[PDB]
């Protein structure tokens, strides 16, 4: 019994504490909604939560490899509403989280840049 539903939506109004981090989702942040059935209450059948772009993608890097979630940039209900510019930012996360395509094997890479305008 493995049923998992994921959706893509953008923040519209109000702030919500994202899961897996000490932050909140405010207008201007894109979040994915995961609808899973919880075997505990009868009224609360399936619940959905919003995540950040690094929190949801960071969980995949730590989650087990045998199971994969969210493949490519066209396997979720919501990316169509997003815009081409915003879609490019989401594709970069999967390319950095997956990497290794032809000749670029890299592991554990972090950079700290500070620019002011
Ligand atoms: Zn977060």
UniProtKB/Swiss-Prot annotation:
Protein origin, superkingdom: Eukaryota
Tissue-wise expression: Testis, thymus, prostate and heart.
Signal peptide location: none
Binding residue positions for Zn(2+): 18, 21, 52, 55
Zn-finger (PARP-type) residues: 6-98
Notes on the domains: The PARP-type zinc finger is required for DNA ligase activity.
Disease the record associates with this protein: Mitochondrial DNA depletion syndrome 20, MNGIE type: An autosomal recessive mitochondrial disorder characterized by severe gut dysmotility, muscle weakness and atrophy, neurological abnormalities including epilepsy, migraine, stroke-like episodes, learning difficulties or cognitive decline, and neurogenic bladder. Brain imaging usually shows diffuse leukoencephalopathy and may show cerebellar atrophy. Disease onset can range from infancy to the teenage years.
Similarity annotation: Belongs to the ATP-dependent DNA ligase family.
Function: Isoform 3 functions as a heterodimer with DNA-repair protein XRCC1 in the nucleus and can correct defective DNA strand-break repair and sister chromatid exchange following treatment with ionizing radiation and alkylating agents. Isoform 1 is targeted to mitochondria, where it functions as a DNA ligase in mitochondrial base-excision DNA repair.
Protein name: DNA ligase 3
UniProt gene name: LIG3
Span of the entire protein shown here: 88 to 204 of 1009
């Amino acid at each position: 019994m493995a049923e998992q539903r994921f959706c893509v939506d953008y923040a519209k109004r109000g702030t919500a504490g994202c899961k897996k981090c000490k932050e909140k989702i405010v207008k201007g942040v894109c979040r994915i909604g995961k609808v899973v059935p919880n075997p505990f209450s009868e009224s609360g059948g399936d619940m959905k939560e919003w995540y950040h772009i690094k929190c949801m993608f960071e969980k995949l890097e730590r989650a087990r490899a045998t199971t994969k979630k969210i493949e490519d940039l066209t396997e979720l209900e919501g990316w169509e509403e997003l815009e081409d510019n915003e879609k490019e930012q989401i594709t970069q996360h999967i390319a950095d989280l997956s990497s290794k395509a032809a000749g670029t094997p890299k592991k554990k890479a972090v950079v700290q840049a500070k620019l002011t305008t």
